[model samples]
Target: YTTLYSSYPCTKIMTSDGQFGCSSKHGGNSGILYLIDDDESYNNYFSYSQQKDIIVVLDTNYFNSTSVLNLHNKSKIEGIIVLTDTKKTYPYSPDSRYPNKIYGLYPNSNLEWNPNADGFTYFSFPFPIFAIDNQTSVAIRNVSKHNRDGQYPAWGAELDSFMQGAINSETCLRRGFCEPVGGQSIWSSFSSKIDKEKEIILVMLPFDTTAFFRDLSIGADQSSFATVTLLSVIKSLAAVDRSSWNKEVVFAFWNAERWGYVGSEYFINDLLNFQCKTYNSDKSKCIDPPRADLAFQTQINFTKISTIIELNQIGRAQLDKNLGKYSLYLHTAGTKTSSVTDILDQVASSYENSTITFKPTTQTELPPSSSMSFLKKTNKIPVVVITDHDYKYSNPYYGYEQDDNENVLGSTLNDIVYILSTFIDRIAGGNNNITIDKNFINILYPCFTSSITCFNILMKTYPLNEVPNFYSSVFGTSLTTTLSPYETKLIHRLLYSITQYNSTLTNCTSDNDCPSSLCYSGQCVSSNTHLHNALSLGFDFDTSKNVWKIVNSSYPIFTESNWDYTALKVFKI
Candidate 1:
């Protein structure tokens, strides 16, 4: 063994037609180091027949698809390495200028919503690539300099990454190696039941996020702050009298929404199509994967939902601490949602003491959001989307490694949650004392934005790895398994902790002893929170063969491949 650095590897992702991302050969691909730091070195290089397999090393400025594509056909270049040392304090998004462009209302419109976005992370690299910008990068540079211009003594790297499932989703899925990119979406309600006679007021937010480096997708501004805000809204709403509310309020935490709104699409399809077959139980309440939806004591469908309130990125709200004020834009699809905005506009008058305003967005087109999935099925549903920006995204680092914990501050989230709770409670017809204590915000800030494990919320599976990553990892192949990803489990537990009401300590032998409560650690906690399957509508699980089968091709279909091992190394020849 010479030496190695465990760097971030860009792996493979597959769709129905073809494959995307990078992958190495069976064992590994090694090459001599070729440093291209200047215009002379890059413009004249590769630009190799038996000159030795060379690995191109480029600075962050030169690490674009054009640069890599130019060197791809060359016979000598084996792999690539980009120095990620540049700190992006300014605007830079890896996503397209108009994210989910094909899935939105305007499919072919060439509008530039996010003008500053470079979309560098969207390209597929043919060769195995690694993003390395650490203290050891200097050592790599020092070793590469010795091999300047075809020198005998040279430094090189071996990229050892192997994808088991190749070609596309059908091929990889047939091999039983990779699965769809989805997970269980948590639809938790502490007080309301969808099986009841009342119409529903649905509040939704996406908790999962994505990036090129799967583990580094800490989308603080894009996703995390909205989750914190929603959870805090739940904490306040729980205090209200359950009977005082006019409609049943159910909070939906959609998972895998980053991957083309998988959760929302499936949820909408199921709400319109899912049927209950259990003979003895209440037929309406008996949904698929019983433990998930029934645990929350809710059985919902699209027809029962009256009003939809969607929470998008809230971390970038223009917060003026001196004036105790913040500004958020209200977005709607059309006249059907005009009345919902009317309610919020009237509610904004109540926030006069707190000085919060909800101005109508200028863009008639709604930004890429979960509500679009609902609007696809039916446009009659009244929808209101609240966000920090009107046109261009305030969050520059959307779905990139640059989305970090520091991008969103706890103080900003605290005020946003307070105002939202007040408005949400007003619409639900409740007079609960709405006050989001800064102390509560203080605890949740680190738990979600920084660490998966925290005080009172011990995630034993990944106790050591405290960094908050929200990548939608592989959904298991099992027919009944919905809680495969650790991030999903963590979110479910956190939701239960925040929504569960404390009951008198009583030893419970079984669920029979506590008819309306759950047995948790010898006490009957008054909670019935559950997770619902968020898999895409395009695919269905085959119980006969124990495999995921493509049932619908008209909708979106994408899956991730399986890998054996991934390692990166550098050595002298």
Candidate 2:
């Protein structure tokens, strides 16, 4: 995933809110509203406002810094808004992790959260925070929305009203389902022999989605990048006989990864203790044996495992302009094995063409991967991460709604699938001659050629045994009959994207269309109140305005005026 340079500021306050700018000096008696640009301003001169209530307007680069967290806690500045260039316009926060757990992303850094504190939380901002893109900031600063003749204050009432309104609406209602608590990790094997004692090489990828919009979650980059690649690899390997190979090859697709690496961590826990965690323990600790444990009980051992290989963000690889070819960076662990790295480098180097080149990183520092959980267990474990980037990420549309299949998985997906398949085969003692089938490659073309067909293909290609049919988790009920307004619209959108159904459906227009919905940007859409009441996270396609605004539920579920008992809540507060 690419580094999120700034925060999403579409929700920022504009001139219409009434206030303008506020200016104050340090240690002059009244409160100070510190306007800063870079990290140096906060680190070097922040003490000047420690004694007063301060409002910081800083750049988005400081969003993930420890200093921001510390500053919020140590100072009386209870409000802030980050500014950044338009290219960096995404909600960029640190990757979510366990409270005390550490990952390779920040090696040697301690996880900073006091569970014992009064209001314990992770990824917290003590004060109100907002983000404004450079373009929007410039536009807002250029003109006054009110068009008033009077001069505004240094800290104008317009600014104050906008900030207050934003603060009041800052509460977020997350809507996504968590895995059934203490859910066992799902594992599958692909090998010639079924011997438990045999040494195994694991090839893993995450199988779950992150970034939810109401009940709709399209984790095209985060999960599908490695998943579809693995599926293609598996299809290729199935063609060649594995009986002659010396070692067993295990293919694992982990779930609940977005929720603090639950799948990976649970799998590791079982590898160490030989038991799955009991559902909802005091410490959420591992305990009992699942009925399905027979598949793994004696089949594999951690000590005998030789190497673990992971492929992440394989979909959105960029071509290095200087090299005139896309370069995939190979990351290795602390303890190196000459044979593994040598084979990877040799295979990638041999495939060097005019378009793509795979190069091994000179540094030993491994980027964050599923391998990180294993290394956390035993630091010396041999591991390799195949990614499109080494120092920074190339996939700009990562972990967001905009990261759809078209943007993330391009034409290079086929090449990625083929190269990874061949690479995995060679490392697992199979000949490098194995190649992905052309039919499989063709099956993936809908992603690029047609949006509707692509969505249909996704349903067929998704690897989970039970695909989520509706956003709601309700069982024994058909969604067609009991869908809520949000559910109805989401289904309509999905159908339109997949089947082109209801594409022209619109609310009343020019006061002659539907009375229930609002008309904007030449299209009638559900009113903001209706969307908010529906618990929806979507946008009104306002073609006239040529802008996108995040939509939300206006009324809480089951209010006296508007009540629906069937509405399901997907996310926990």
Best by lDDT: 1
Backbone atom clashes (below 3 Å) for every candidate? 2, 17
* Per-residue lDDT of model 1, residues 1-573, tens digit only: 454553677778878888777777778778987777667767767554435587777765566556666774355567877665555445567677887677666778777777777676656555687766455566666666567756566578888877777788887877776788888888776663455677888899888887767666778888988887888778766666666677777899998887778888877766666555552364324535433344332366567777889999888776656656667888886347776777676665665465566777898688888888887876767788888888888887887767777776565675567777776777777666676756667777777787756543334356433557787777667546654566677777667666776654678755457656655556666654666767777787887778888887665677887888777888767
Model 2 reaches what TM-score against the true structure? 0.51
How far off is model 1, as Cα RMSD?
Answer: 4.0
Error of 1 at 60 (Å): 3.4
Highest TM-score model number: 1
RMSD each, Å: 4.0, 16.5
Output the lDDT of residue 341, model 2: 71
Q: Write the per-residue lDDT of candidate 2 for residues 1-573, one digit (tens) a residue.
A: 111222231111111112111111111112233555455666644455333554555554454445465564344664554443422344332323322134234546443221112111122232334444355444322322221222433221011111122111222111111101112233445532246666778888654543312122344555555666766676676677665667777776654344345457656665677554553233222234322223344456877777888876666666788877677777777466566777765665566552556677765456556677787777565687777766555554443333455556466766776677777778776775776766755653333222313333213233221112112211111101122322223222222222111213454344236343333324444311111011111222233443222353221111010111111001100
Instruction: Give all TM-scores, in the order shown.
Output: 0.85, 0.51
Which 10 successive residues of model 1 have the least lDDT summed? 289-298
